[PDB]
Write a protein that binds this ligand. Structure first.
Ligand SMILES: OC[C@H]1OCC[C@@H](O[C@H]2O[C@H](CO)[C@@H](O)[C@H](O)[C@@H]2O)[C@@H]1O
Length: 349
């Protein structure tokens, strides 16, 4: 078929599975969330918590699906249909190494639901406690062993792919042990080889030798807020792509529709990026495509705390908060606008 509606398997959408309901999970997990103290606000702050009631959730927006559970198979079905609408072929699943049966259940449910719609799943390896290259290797082995034969497990030219968030928290000399073909605990040329995509944050003078010396296969930028880092400044993407191509690296810039996290970080208003009825998303996605990249990542499907989600949101005013909403656009606008950009990306590929 050549309908201009098929999934794109070089488009990765960051997905969060940490939402809970009292009924399914015992608590409205993540809809309830601690409010962060101001890191520049001095001592004795008592910022409190967002309780995750119907009226007061830990987002500046409000989900069309309500305070859902990430463990609810019926929600997962709906999410996969939303991925199909968006044409996003890869779900990049947050992974916190919780070592708990409820995590294991969720991951299996997500893989199963994804496969019904021919969506693929890869893992976004988060900065879990004491993360280091040895336990990373062990966890990569575990994930490939447990899930590598699942039909929804993502591969690119035969290799799994992992995104590594805050990869700068680990020195290049440690990464080399895992990721150089000669490394002490290498995955290269083993059953557990994978494309390892590190987080490019700051200036080229720092990031270029970091990526080379660490032996990452590529890099991504994550942040949905333009200008938050050098890497999330889209005017740098042409030059970042040129460097990537020269050095055999895969650049996967991250694009998002906006940013606002002031319910959970009230002091963080300088990072707000307004959606402007889709014009912000359009500008960022256009820059990624114009840079000539081979793959794009989307921040985010459903990071509701940070206001970067493309998942449908609805107008809502409760007695506790007046939420933002998609304004003049309909609740599914960011899904269908993603599909528009996926088509432009494919036309360019
Ligand atoms: O997936 C990479 C990162 O994406 C942004 C969120 C971040 O998690 C931190 O922030 C959220 C709030 O937005 C907290 O709920 C988490 O516990 C964590 O501090 C991801 O690491």
């Amino acid at each position: 078929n050549n309908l201009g509606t098929e999934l794109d398997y070089d488009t990765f959408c960051f997905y969060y599975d940490w939402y809970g309901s009292e009924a399914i999970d015992g608590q409205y997990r993540h809809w309830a969330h601690a409010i962060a103290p101001d890191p520049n606000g001095g001592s004795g702050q008592n910022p409190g918590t967002i309780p995750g009631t119907q009226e007061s959730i830990a987002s500046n927006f409000y989900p069309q699906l309500g305070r859902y559970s990430s463990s609810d198979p019926n929600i997962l079905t709906k999410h996969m249909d939303m991925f199909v609408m968006a044409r996003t072929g890869v779900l990049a699943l947050t992974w916190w190494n919780e070592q708990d049966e409820t995590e294991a259940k969720r991951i299996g449910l997500i893989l199963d639901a994804a496969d019904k719609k021919k969506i693929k799943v890869c893992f976004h390896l988060e900065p879990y406690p004491s993360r280091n290259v040895q336990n990373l290797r062990e966890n990569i082995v575990k994930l490939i062993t447990r899930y590598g034969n699942h039909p929804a497990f993502y591969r690119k030219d035969g290799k799994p792919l992992f995104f590594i968030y805050d990869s700068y928290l680990i020195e290049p000399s440690e990464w080399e042990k895992l990721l150089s073909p000669g490394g002490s605990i290498t995955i290269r040329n083993t059953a557990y080889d994978a494309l390892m995509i590190g987080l490019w944050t700051s200036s080229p003078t720092v990031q270029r030798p970091f990526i080379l010396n660490a032996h990452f296969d590529g890099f991504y930028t994550y942040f949905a807020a333009t200008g938050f880092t050098y890497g999330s400044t889209p005017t740098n993407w042409v030059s970042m792509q040129k460097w990537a191509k020269e050095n055999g690296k895969i650049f996967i810039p991250s694009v998002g529709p906006g940013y606002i996290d002031t319910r959970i970080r009230p002091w963080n208003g300088s990072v707000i990026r307004t959606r402007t009825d889709g014009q912000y998303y359009d500008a960022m996605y256009r820059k990624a495509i114009e840079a000539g990249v081979s793959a794009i990542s989307i921040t985010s499907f459903n990071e509701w705390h940070e206001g970067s989600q493309i998942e449908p949101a609805v107008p809502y005013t409760s007695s506790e908060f007046t939420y933002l909403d998609y304004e003049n656009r309909e609740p599914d606008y960011y899904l269908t606008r993603t599909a528009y950009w996926v088509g432009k990306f494919r036309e360019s590929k």
